[PDB]
Amino acid sequence: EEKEILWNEAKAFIAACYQELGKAAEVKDRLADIKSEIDLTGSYVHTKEELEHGAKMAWRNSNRCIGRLFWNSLNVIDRRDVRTKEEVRDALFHHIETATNNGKIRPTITIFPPEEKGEKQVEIWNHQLIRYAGYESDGERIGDPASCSLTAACEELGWRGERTDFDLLPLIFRMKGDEQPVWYELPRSLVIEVPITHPDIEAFSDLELKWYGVPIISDMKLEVGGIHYNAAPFNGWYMGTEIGARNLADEKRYDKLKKVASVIGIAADYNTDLWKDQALVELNKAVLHSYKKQGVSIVDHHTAASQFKRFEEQAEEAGRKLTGDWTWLIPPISPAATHIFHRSYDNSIVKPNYFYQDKPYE
Amino acid sequence: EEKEILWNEAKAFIAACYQELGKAAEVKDRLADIKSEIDLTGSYVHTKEELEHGAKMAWRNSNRCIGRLFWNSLNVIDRRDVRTKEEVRDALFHHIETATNNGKIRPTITIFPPEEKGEKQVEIWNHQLIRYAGYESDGERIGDPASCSLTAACEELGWRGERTDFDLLPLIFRMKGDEQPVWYELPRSLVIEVPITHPDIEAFSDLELKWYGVPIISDMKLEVGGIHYNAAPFNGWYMGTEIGARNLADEKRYDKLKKVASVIGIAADYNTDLWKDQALVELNKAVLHSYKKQGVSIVDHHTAASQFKRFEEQAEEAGRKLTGDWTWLIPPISPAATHIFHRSYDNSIVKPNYFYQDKPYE
Numbered sequence: 165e166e167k168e169i170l171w172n173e174a175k176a177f178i179a180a181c182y183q184e185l186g187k188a189a190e191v192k193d194r195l196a197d198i199k200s201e202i203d204l205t206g207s208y209v210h211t212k213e214e215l216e217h218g219a220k221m222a223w224r225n226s227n228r229c230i231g232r233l234f235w236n237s238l239n240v241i242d243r244r245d246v247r248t249k250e251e252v253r254d255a256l257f258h259h260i261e262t263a264t265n266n267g268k269i270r271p272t273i274t275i276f277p278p279e280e281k282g283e284k285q286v287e288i289w290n291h292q293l294i295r296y297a298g299y300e301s302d303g304e305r306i307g308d309p310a311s312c313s314l315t316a317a318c319e320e321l322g323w324r325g326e327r328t329d330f331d332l333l334p335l336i337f338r339m340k341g342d343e344q345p346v347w348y349e350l351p352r353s354l355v356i357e358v359p360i361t362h363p364d365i366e367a368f369s370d371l372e373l374k375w376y377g378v379p380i381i382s383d384m385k386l387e388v389g390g391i392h393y394n395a396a397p398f399n400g401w402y403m404g405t406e407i408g409a410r411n412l413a414d415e416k417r418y419d420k421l422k423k424v425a426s427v428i429g430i431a432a433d434y435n436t437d438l439w440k441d442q443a444l445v446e447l448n449k450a451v452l453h454s455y456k457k458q459g460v461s462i463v464d465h466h467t468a469a470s471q472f473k474r475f476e477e478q479a480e481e482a483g484r485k486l487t488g489d490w491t492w493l494i495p496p497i498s499p500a501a502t503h504i505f506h507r508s509y510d511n512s513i514v515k516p517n518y519f520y521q522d523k524p525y526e
Numbered sequence: 527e528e529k530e531i532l533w534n535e536a537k538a539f540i541a542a543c544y545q546e547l548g549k550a551a552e553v554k555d556r557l558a559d560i561k562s563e564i565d566l567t568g569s570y571v572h573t574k575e576e577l578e579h580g581a582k583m584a585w586r587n588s589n590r591c592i593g594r595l596f597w598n599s600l601n602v603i604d605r606r607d608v609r610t611k612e613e614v615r616d617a618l619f620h621h622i623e624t625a626t627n628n629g630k631i632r633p634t635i636t637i638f639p640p641e642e643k644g645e646k647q648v649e650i651w652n653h654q655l656i657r658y659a660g661y662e663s664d665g666e667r668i669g670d671p672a673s674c675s676l677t678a679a680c681e682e683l684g685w686r687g688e689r690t691d692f693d694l695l696p697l698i699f700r701m702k703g704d705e706q707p708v709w710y711e712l713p714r715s716l717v718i719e720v721p722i723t724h725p726d727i728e729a730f731s732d733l734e735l736k737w738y739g740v741p742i743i744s745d746m747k748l749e750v751g752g753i754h755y756n757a758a759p760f761n762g763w764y765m766g767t768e769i770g771a772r773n774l775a776d777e778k779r780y781d782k783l784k785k786v787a788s789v790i791g792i793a794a795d796y797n798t799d800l801w802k803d804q805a806l807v808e809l810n811k812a813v814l815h816s817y818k819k820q821g822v823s824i825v826d827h828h829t830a831a832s833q834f835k836r837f838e839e840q841a842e843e844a845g846r847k848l849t850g851d852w853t854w855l856i857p858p859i860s861p862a863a864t865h866i867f868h869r870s871y872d873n874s875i876v877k878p879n880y881f882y883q884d885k886p887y888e
């Protein structure tokens with residue numbers, strides 16, 4: 165059954181990929197080589213062209229992603245050659261460096277060896293390559309609550325956080341054959357952070373907020389033609405709302421809205437004053453202003469929605485079905501001010517794609 | 527088939543209704559009377575108790591409604607006795623009066639004779655009993671674009687609007703047997719309107735915005751136990767966002783955000799300034815402030831979401847399945863600041879319920 169799943173997924177991928185790449189005539193012969201390879205080895209190896217286009221198609225098929233207009237310009241780094249943890253570490257360090265690009269973020273994916281018999285070659289524990297630790301002791305809350313379980317796991321492995329609200333987690337990953345993951349502290353010279361200030365309200369800096377420049381998702385599985393790339397960290401730039409309306413705003417995250425209300429000088433007493441709404445707008449303005457001021461790429465939700473409209477138009481013109489998840493595409497502030505809110509999307513799963521996978525801790 | 531649909535829907539309704547009303551022992555005998563009545567007449571007549579509880583259950587089952595906490599206190603007016611257009615008109619006038627209640631809005635439904643053989647006894651053309659006209663001539667846009675087709679229809683029937691941005695449409699409805707609907711101008715003494723001012727910004731009144739106090743939906747079908755009440759107008763009070771974030775804000779409605787930005791003294795030049803978001807918050811603050819100032823009932827989206835949470839808890843405690851439409855329940859401003867955004871809802875259709883029906887014009 166599993167070999168059959170592989171062969172069926174391979175046929176569909178190669179046909180579609182080579183079609184898009186104007187290589188339709190080569191499908192028959194390539195499919196033959198693959199079937200022989202599957203027959204003999206139980207798997208098959210992608211060409212660099214297939215891997216690159218596969219990762220791009222996967223982005224193009226991500227229903228929840230508003231940033232998909234730029235799917236074809238993804239920078240793909242092929243690291244299927246890594247065998248040692250030093251090589252994995254250096255590949256992760258390099259990814260941070262080249263993606264960051266001094267603030268002018270390059271959307272990038274680094275692809276590590278794929279699963280073989282469902283057996284992982286490299287198992288990354290981080291949710292993102294750069295993320296803040298979180299602590300909860302006797303209801304003493306410090307840092308990012310979303311990171312509490314990974315933080316506890318790292319502190320089982322000999323690491324110790326300083327317990328500021330913004331401790332950088334180390335990279336943590338496990339190699340096939342090892343029982344325990346290893347961890348490496350991030351070189352600070354690689355990590356761009358942005359202090360949050362407001363363009364008009366000087367007091368906003370009293371909150372001493374900051375965020376990291378580059379979100380690099382390192383816990384999702386890239387699936388291409390039946391091949392499972394469980395370790396394939398990827399990044400874009402942020403849409404402002406992700407930081408201003410969720411990461412810093414959610415009650416189960418940094419929960420900063422009451423403090424925002426205070427520094428911008430409004431009461432946080434009555435629902436009818438819409439103080440949370442007002443606070444949300446000012447915090448989101450601050451985030452965009454701050455990233456811009458520091459020369460770190462970011463997009464606001466209106467511009468991103470405009471871009472996504474172009475993506476919809478591009479798909480229609482190319483004759484491709486458009487898929488999307490309305491519930492994730494709408495931004496968490498002023499969603500009805502975007503076109504997205506006023507239409508519907510087919511939420512069908514199309515592969516290649518990026519998928520959730522079980523966490524190796526917890 | 528149709529008689530069978532009726533009987534099956536009746537059995538399920540009576541069993542459930544009498545169950546909730548602690549009248550389970552009376553189900554058998556009542557079901558017998560109904561089946562005989564259906565056999566002989568092709569339909570059946572609800573008791574006043576069934577009709578009242580049916581309209582309440584219907585509200586309780588409205589997946590898109592955030593205001594459902596108060597389902598059991600609906601004021602039901604039984605007008606199955608009307609036979610003349612004067613009686614229909616006076617029943618509609620009375621509904622406006624008693625629901626308005628000098629500003630302290632009473633959630634109310636007036637129920638007219640139901641369809642017989644799918645044949646309507648009374649056919650209401652209005653979307654809401656109180657609504658503003660809309661005009662579009664050579665790209666001269668006046669009033670509410672949502673009302674353009676109904677407005678054109680009324681002007682075919684001898685009515686003429688003054689062509690302000692806030693012309694009150696007349697009541698318009700058709701009696702069984704008549705080819706054309708009749709229309710009656712609304713007595714102004716019955717219609718409460720609210721001028722929109724801002725609590726802090728005096729210039730906001732320069733926009734000369736207003737809205738009507740009581741939204742009374744008059745174009746949806748109430749379905750109870752297989753009986754189709756096509757004419758059953760109902761009202762609650764507004765949630766502020768319906769006016770501030772949609773009716774006055776949508777580009778295809780009153781489209782006021784650029785003018786709001788101007789009067790509150792911010793630039794409307796750059797997406798990154800989040801001027802639309804800021805304008806939305808201030809316009810929504812103005813709407814709540816204005817309704818409160820005039821002593822007209824209204825609810826903000828945070829309070830309404832809190833109430834809906836209680837509705838969820840109430841359902842769980844009573845052992846009832848909860849159904850909802852996530853996409854409609856989330857408010858159009860700061861949705862992620864409500865609990866609704868962070869959970870999911872079963873969007874199954876449960877009857878009794880309120881449904882869309884075809885418009886008799888257009």
Ligand code: HEM
Pocket residue numbers: 219223226228229230231232234238271272273398399400401402403406463468492518
């Ligand atoms: C270039 C800038 C990009 C922007 C502004 C952007 C924007 C977003 C946003 C705002 C989300 C929702 C995240 C959340 O609410 O948690 C998202 C989801 C997603 N994006 Fe993108 N994105 C970008 C690039 C990329 C790239 C390069 C990839 C991968 C190649 C990608 C794949 C995804 C995936 C898989 C999700 C879903 C995550 C999940 O389900 O948890 N995006 N994107």
Ligand code: HEM
Pocket residue numbers: 581585588590591592593594596600633634635760761762763764765768825830854880
């Ligand atoms: C008491 C105050 C009430 C509030 C604040 C409230 C709030 C709302 C809101 C905000 C919507 C969404 C409307 C839209 O976006 O167009 C809605 C939908 C709805 N409400 Fe309520 N509601 C209330 C009472 C009622 C009552 C009394 C009924 C009927 C008995 C009702 C039945 C519905 C229905 C059927 C919808 C769906 C309309 C559609 O699909 O277009 N609600 N409610």
Ligand SMILES: N=C(Nc1cccc(CNC[C@@H]2CCCN2)c1)c1cccs1
Pocket residue numbers: 310379380381398399400401402403406
């Ligand atoms: N801008 C981005 N946002 C993004 C995309 C995918 C996933 C995530 C991470 N979402 C984390 C949240 C944390 C609460 C629930 N999931 C962020 C990108 C990250 C990586 C590439 S684009």
Ligand SMILES: N=C(Nc1cccc(CNC[C@@H]2CCCN2)c1)c1cccs1
Pocket residue numbers: 672741742743760761762763764765768
């Ligand atoms: N507060 C209310 N809002 C409400 C409820 C149902 C329907 C409507 C009308 N929605 C009209 C919009 C117009 C654009 C698409 N439909 C409003 C209530 C109206 C009647 C009872 S509650």
Ligand SMILES: C[C@H](O)[C@H](O)[C@H]1CNc2nc(N)[nH]c(=O)c2N1
Pocket residue numbers: 505506507508853854855856
């Ligand atoms: C396309 C989408 O379903 C549509 O725009 C919906 C979204 N959610 C909504 N929610 C409410 N309350 N009211 C609406 O009119 C809409 N419009």
Ligand SMILES: C[C@H](O)[C@H](O)[C@H]1CNc2nc(N)[nH]c(=O)c2N1
Pocket residue numbers: 491492493494867868869870
């Ligand atoms: C329950 C609901 O599906 C969940 O809260 C979703 C809603 N839409 C979202 N949309 C985005 N972009 N990100 C999220 O984390 C969520 N959360």
Ligand SMILES: [Cl-]
Pocket residue numbers: 379406411
């Ligand atoms: Cl994030």
Ligand SMILES: [Cl-]
Pocket residue numbers: 741768773
């Ligand atoms: Cl309305």
